[PDB]
């Protein structure tokens, strides 16, 4: 049945879980026994995310645990795929690192490096548009992450402020690889979706469009529509002046390149990173 087991598709480590604080003969879960919980960072239909201290190394991590036991084999496969997707991405300074994953009692656990607040949370705390200085840094870092994915034929499919995490000295990292697809499935948040996805045209360009709207929202403190005329206008090269009049011409120009409705004409992440405005500061 459902005995505690490491989850890894590159199958390097032993399937057997061990830790200081853990004895499999006691009834508590590996998660209960092997970590000190400090706070709940978030929750939703998926389950919960905890800030923890590891008993193995004494360091801080985030652990995401699913809500309820697997519904069956297709549910199990869909959830375990997040681990596979993380492994396909591989280590990169602008991508959230997976430390380990395991299953027990039909629950999946993913232990990632502890980052700062999501970009969404950061903008909520700020309570206003972010300064452009901050925005350029976060755009560059998220572009670096997308360049890494796209070079491997991977599409994130759900780029948004909630899935980008701050770090020290004005850096950020892309996370939440649950919807990632390997070119050659599930839908991302409709507020950020590329217009070509309506015709089933999946490609790396879709993430560039999503990041364009992400940056628009954070730079302008603008709530994005989930449908209607406003949703269509943002996919027809329109920028509302009531929100966007304050942008520098340089930042506006980069956003227009990323929000290009035709994916064949839209800028690539590598092309954007070569522009003098987006080069290492």
UniProtKB/Swiss-Prot annotation:
Record's keyword terms, sorted: Acetylation, ATP-binding, Cell cycle, Endoplasmic reticulum, Golgi apparatus, Kinase, Magnesium, Membrane, Metal-binding, Nucleotide-binding, Phosphoprotein, Serine/threonine-protein kinase, Transferase
Mod. after translation: Autophosphorylated. Phosphorylated by CDC2-CCNB1 complexes on undefined serine and threonine residues. The phosphorylation by CDC2-CCNB1 complexes may inhibit the catalytic activity.
Membrane topology label: Peripheral membrane protein
Effect of residue 176 to A: Loss of kinase activity
The family this protein is said to belong to: Belongs to the protein kinase superfamily. Ser/Thr protein kinase family. WEE1 subfamily.
Binding positions for Mg(2+) 2 per the UniProt entry: 178
List of residues binding ATP: 41-49, 64
Primary residence: endoplasmic reticulum
PTM-bearing positions, type Phosphoserine: 19, 45, 68, 85
Protein name: Membrane-associated tyrosine- and threonine-specific cdc2-inhibitory kinase
Active site, renumbered: 158 (proton acceptor)
Gene (name only): PKMYT1
Positions of disulphide bridges: none
